[PDB]
């Protein structure tokens, strides 16, 4: 009913399928390796861009501090100019008085 030869036939049949499965596994292993390599590189570049952006952001915060400080200085100078104006007018108007006399 079941000859050694029929069994042999099944074995060669199973062996042929396994050959195909193994070749497919080889193709997939290669794709997984390449993908791991791509991910590793993206990780590295992402960390690098994070560091670069970190430096920019740190400069930006300094620029914020600086802008606040310069504004404060401009306000102070403006204040000094207005005070001088009061003083100049005092001298101007007094000269008007003397000159007319």
């Amino acid at each position: 009913p079941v000859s050694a030869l029929s069994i042999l036939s099944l074995l060669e049949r199973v062996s042929t399928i396994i050959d195909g499965v193994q070749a497919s596994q080889q193709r997939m292993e290669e794709r997984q390796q390449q993908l791991e390599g791509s991910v590793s590189a993206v990780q590295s570049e992402l960390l690098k861009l994070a560091r670069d952006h970190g430096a920019t952001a740190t400069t930006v915060d300094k620029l914020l501090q600086k802008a606040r400080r310069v504004s404060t200085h401009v306000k102070e100078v403006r204040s000094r100019v207005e005070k001088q104006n009061v003083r100049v007018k005092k001298v101007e108007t007094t000269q008007d008085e003397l000159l007319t006399r």
Copy 2:
């Protein structure tokens, strides 16, 4: 030829058990890969948001720079106008005696 059948069966059983074990390892490797990809996607979006915040702040700094530069030119102008008024007063006093 019973021996040759048993030998071949043994090799096949051996080979498929290895193939199965390998497939399991590959399943595992791919799920680890999915996790790593999900992680980089997440970190990229976070960095994108962080940069967007920085770029937003930078535009404000541009705006603030324009305003300050205008204020400085204006204060300069006032100072020059006062210079002229002071010179007139100096000249007049030198002349008043």
Copy 3:
């Protein structure tokens, strides 16, 4: 023992079915992951170019900051000289109004 041999081969066949099902799912997921990584690479590069532009603008803001700082110091210098010139005229006018 032919049936015991065929039983072992039936089990081998079931294992092959399971591996092949897994291989199909693995191929579907692998293509998806490869697409996802490609998208990450592209978006990362875009973010890098965008940051490059931001970094350039910041370097310009730094020079603007230096420039304006220099102008404020020059203006303040003139305000201080004018203060001395005004004091000069003030003190003399007060002198003249004495006696």
